Nucleic acid binder design. Structure first.
Lengths: 80, 123, 205, 150, 129
RNA sequence: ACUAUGGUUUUUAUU
RNA sequence: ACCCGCAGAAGAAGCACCGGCUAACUCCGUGCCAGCAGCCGCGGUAAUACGGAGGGUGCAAGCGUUAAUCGGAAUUACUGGGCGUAAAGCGCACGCAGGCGGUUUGUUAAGUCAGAUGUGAAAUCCCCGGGCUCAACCUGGGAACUGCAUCUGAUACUGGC
RNA sequence: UAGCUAGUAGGUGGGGUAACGGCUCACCUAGGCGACGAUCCCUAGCUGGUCUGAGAGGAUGACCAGCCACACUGGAACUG
């Protein structure tokens, strides 16, 4: 493994994919205050059991489609 | 202004206004010249002074100052203009060049004789 | 460039004899030196400190014959490695080949020495040097070439130097017209230990 | 003896009924050359009588400040009526630096040089008051020393 | 304010010096107690005690020594509105070394003198002189 | 407080 | 390149500036004109400011006259503002993405901090050595490129559990 | 400047290359981007660096070293 993250599902409208939101966790480079900053990943998932608002664990890979370079590992917390 | 505002979107300088945008930020600019006439300054500085109406190479016309004694400038003569600040004579931010193109220099300069493109004393 | 024209005007502005036309015409002055630069000074005196600072900027460089750009270029090497710029600058100006050839006695002025250096007559470390922008190394040899040793102007420069005191930071054998430069001098040994508050603020802004 | 320095003197115009009348006003500092200082201001007729009045008021507004061998160890701030001054320790480079009131006040006090800047109201008669407030904003001479032991 | 427990300690001491008081009492916390113990160690207080019946109150006895004042500086550095963190070689040096800076560290509240000798960095809480 | 009322004077050396 | 000679001062000095800021002085002419000018301001009968002067100052193969991009400018404010009245507190309460969050133990190491392995090419400021007649130039070395990665580690506090 | 996007976002079957991929053909879906600024306009090639200033942050990427793109203009092919 090279990169592995946790984030929250925001779109489940796909049969072999999901859209996951992740945080930057960053100091603003001139105003010095900390910010969350939400960035999106389109993630591979062939099981199709994780859903919107659930918390997921994801891993970085070689490209599987255009704009699709990550794949699902686990469902961490279930939001019902 | 707050950091929570500047982190969401930065704010912009307002505005430092430009003096002579008709010169295209060049050190000199050319123009064709129409009419040459006398104009009067603000009365505390009372005198007569001379100007010309100069359409440039670009879309703009300016009222340009003529320094130095001698009237022989003509229409469609094609002359050079420089930005030069005049604050007691109406609408003038611009000076004519005597030392270049279809302009004449000034006679009998006793002091500061390199002005107006005037050469070494021989006359 | 360098200055050209009437010379007594120069000694009059410096308030001091410059060895310019200073034979029997120097004896008990009567030449406006120490009296009258220009012609005015006593009736509408402004006494401006910018004028004394401008006077110091002329005064400090004209003694060495160096121009403004040359003087600020030595000041660039005095202002690095902390301040104390007046003492650190002294070591650079006193290390010049025209100043060293004048202190070895071969010229009656630094300009006469600078004009002997241009005339191919001076050699340092065994080779010929014709620039005054050189800097002499400690325990290195400075010498004059044979075809200049009998010149009436140089004869008179060593004749003037042997009627004055010796600088201790070099030595020369008059039986060879050759010897070594020991060290760059110290501002408190070359004159006295004092503070000059203008030279430490001189040039820039 | 208390040592003197002139900061400024100038002619002052006043337009009255039918004409102008002229005066002179002087800005001065007086100190002991070790740690005691005061600033003076005064209007009169002719320069030497305006300086005389200003020097007489400098000798009436004095303050006494203790400094370890005349140094300003730390960065220090002076305030008076919207005039602000800030002083910083140097690096033995150019070192001096700063002019007018921020040069003269420390000179008649015999105090070692600092890097200095003014803010707010730049009028000299209140900037000088901020400079002698910043002199009093400095710590005890000598304090650590016995406040905290090695 | 409940949003900051350090202003609740520092400004009580500046207002107590402005009131020229010998002792100051505050609502307690492990962090206020850890800071009181190092203010005793660095010679700004002579005593700290925690007393109460249903909630703890921390009472500090201020160490003025030989004249007026206990602080020339008591300045807040890191805050809830802006965090301030330094590495071991970027540690501040308060008032030409006349003052101290207070550092958080993974090993517990210490001086910049102690953090520099340990070879550590962290959050800079305040400056004291 | 102690009668309810009455408009205009060219820009100008210029201190 | 370098070396030695053959002729003759011969082939060579400009340009603003001089009331005050701003160093250089104040005679006569003009009489709000003619002109000056960066800023302040000057010009109607001795004008220190124009013209005309003779003298005087400063840079110098440059000197004056400008433009670009910055500085002075906190004049977009992190460092570093303004809102009672000198610009602007929005008429009041309700809800809300975001910003801040008691008092403690345990867990995590994302923030942070520590130590390693890399990468930040060569050139370059800074700093130490050497050679070209000096510097530039040609360069031997050390700093630095505050970072961004790959391990290992502390665990106080913010975040997460 | 508030909308912009039908190969755009996603699926299901077949192909092409030295390899990635809606690279490409077909059958189905309504997604995706956008106030942390999409659409659109003026301006501008990227980095090492250069460089103003107290410094921040900008400005500036002629020279030397390494990338991008152009070869009057547009669009293809042949060959390695």
């Amino acid at each position: 493994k090279i990169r592995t993250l946790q984030g929250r599902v925001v779109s489940d409208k796909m049969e072999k994919s999901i859209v996951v939101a992740i945080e930057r966790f960053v100091k603003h480079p001139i105003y010095g205050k900390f910010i969350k900053r939400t960035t999106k990943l389109h993630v591979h998932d062939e099981n199709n059991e994780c859903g919107i608002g659930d918390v997921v664990e994801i891993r970085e890979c070689r490209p599987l489609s255009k704009t699709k370079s990550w794949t699902l590992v686990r469902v961490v917390e279930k939001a019902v | 202004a707050t950091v929570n505002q500047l982190v969401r979107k930065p704010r912009a300088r307002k505005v430092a206004k430009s003096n002579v945008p008709a010169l295209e930020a060049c050190p000199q600019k050319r123009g064709v010249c129409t009419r040459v006439y006398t104009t009067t300054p603000k009365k505390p500085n009372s005198a007569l002074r001379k100007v010309c109406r100069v359409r440039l190479t670009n879309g703009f016309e300016v009222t340009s100052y003529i320094g130095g004694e001698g009237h022989n400038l003509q229409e469609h003569s094609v002359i050079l203009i420089r930005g030069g600040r005049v604050k007691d004579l109406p609408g003038v931010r611009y000076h004519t060049v005597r030392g270049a193109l279809d302009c004449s220099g000034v006679k009998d300069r006793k002091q500061a004789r390199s002005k107006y493109g005037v050469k070494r004393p021989k006359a | 460039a360098r200055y050209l024209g009437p010379k007594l005007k120069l000694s009059r502005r410096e308030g001091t004899d410059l060895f310019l036309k200073s034979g029997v015409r120097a004896i008990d002055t009567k030449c406006k030196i120490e009296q009258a630069p220009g012609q005015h000074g006593a009736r509408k005196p402004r006494l401006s400190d910018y004028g004394v600072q401008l006077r110091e900027k002329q005064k400090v460089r004209r003694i060495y014959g160096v121009l403004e750009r040359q003087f600020r270029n030595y000041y660039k090497e005095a202002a690095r490695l902390k301040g104390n710029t007046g003492e650190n600058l002294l070591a650079l100006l006193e290390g010049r080949l025209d100043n060293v050839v004048y202190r070895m006695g071969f010229g009656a002025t630094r300009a006469e020495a600078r004009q002997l250096v241009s005339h191919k007559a001076i050699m340092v470390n065994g080779r010929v040097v014709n620039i005054a922008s050189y800097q002499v190394s400690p325990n290195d040899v400075v010498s004059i070439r044979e075809k200049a040793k009998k010149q009436s102007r140089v004869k008179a420069a060593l004749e003037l130097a042997e009627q004055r005191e010796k600088p201790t930071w070099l030595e020369v054998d008059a039986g060879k017209m050759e010897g070594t430069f020991k060290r760059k001098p110290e501002r408190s040994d070359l004159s006295a230990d004092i503070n000059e508050h203008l030279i430490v603020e001189l040039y820039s802004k | 003896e208390l040592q003197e320095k002139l900061i400024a003197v100038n002619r002052v115009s006043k337009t009255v009924k039918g004409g102008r009348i002229f005066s002179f006003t002087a800005l001065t500092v007086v100190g002991d050359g070790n740690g005691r200082v005061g600033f003076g201001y005064g209007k009169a007729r002719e320069v030497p009588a305006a300086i005389q009045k200003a020097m007489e008021k400098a000798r009436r507004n004095m303050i006494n400040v203790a400094l370890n061998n005349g140094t300003l160890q730390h960065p220090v701030k002076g305030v008076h009526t919207g005039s602000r001054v800030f002083m910083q320790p140097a690096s033995e480079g150019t070192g001096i630096i700063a002019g007018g009131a921020m040069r003269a006040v420390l000179e008649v006090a015999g105090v070692h040089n600092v890097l200095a800047k003014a803010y707010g109201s730049t009028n000299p008669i209140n900037v000088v008051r901020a400079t002698i407030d910043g002199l009093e904003n400095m710590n005890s001479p000598e304090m650590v020393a016995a406040k905290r032991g090695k | 304010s409940m949003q900051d427990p350090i202003a609740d300690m520092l400004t009580r001491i500046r207002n107590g010096q402005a009131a020229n008081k010998a002792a100051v009492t505050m609502p307690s916390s492990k962090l206020k107690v850890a800071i009181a113990n190092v203010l005793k160690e660095e010679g700004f207080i002579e005593d700290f005690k925690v007393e109460g019946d249903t909630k703890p109150e921390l009472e500090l006895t201020l160490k003025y020594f030989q004249g007026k004042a206990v602080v020339e500086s008591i300045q807040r550095v890191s805050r809830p509105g802006l965090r301030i963190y330094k590495r071991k070689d970027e540690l501040p040096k308060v008032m030409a070394g006349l003052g101290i800076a207070v550092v958080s560290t993974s090993k517990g509240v210490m001086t910049d003198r102690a953090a520099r000798q340990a070879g550590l960095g962290g959050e800079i809480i305040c400056y004291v002189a």
